[PDB]
Amino acid sequence: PKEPEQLRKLFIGGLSFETTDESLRSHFEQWGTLTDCVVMRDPNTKRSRGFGFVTYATVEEVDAAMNARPHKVDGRVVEPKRAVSRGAHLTVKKIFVGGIKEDTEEHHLRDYFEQYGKIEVIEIMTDRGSGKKRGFAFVTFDDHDSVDKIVIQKYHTVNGHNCEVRKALS
């Protein structure tokens, strides 16, 4: 019933050194129930390390928090990202979509992937010499969270096809 905690956790970078567990929690509780909220501090000086983590009760709340960016916490714009899963580069805006075969068109990919975020480019790969569809595509979004949401899904079905999707980068 409950989603794995790893999927409900946000890493918040770029914190003001003034931010505390309490101020971070007061801010992010606006988008959901926080089961956990921590500002990372040096073990000796207790001076902030400039980042922390918050854990929501559900994935929908993570989505709501991500949709409410930019977040300005204690006067500083911070950088929320979903906890990882090791992938060679973390934060990217483009994905590889494979197993779409020759019958998949850009509207299939768009109609599906647009619900993950704003699409900027859809590039269906075609053979260099014949122009035949190669069975894969690249979608570029305006934001990395679209990609983070996509790649953590176990399945992707586009045009009846069960696709293999992964982060793509240069």
Three-state SS string over 9-57 comes to EEEEECCCCCCCHHHHHHHHHHHCCEEEEEEEECCCCCCEEEEEEEEEC
Resolution of the determined structure in angstroms stands at 1.9
Domain limits, the chain: 3-87, 88-168
Cα separations in angstroms, 89 against 14, 35, 84: 19, 29, 11
Cα separations in angstroms, 16 against 21, 62, 73, 113: 12, 21, 8, 34
CATH of domain 3-87: 3.30.70.330
Cα angle for residues 112, 133, 128 (degrees, 5° grid): 130
**Domains 3-87 and 88-168 alike in fold:** yes
| Residue listed under structure tokens 């990882």 | 84
Q: What CATH class has 88-168?
A: alpha beta
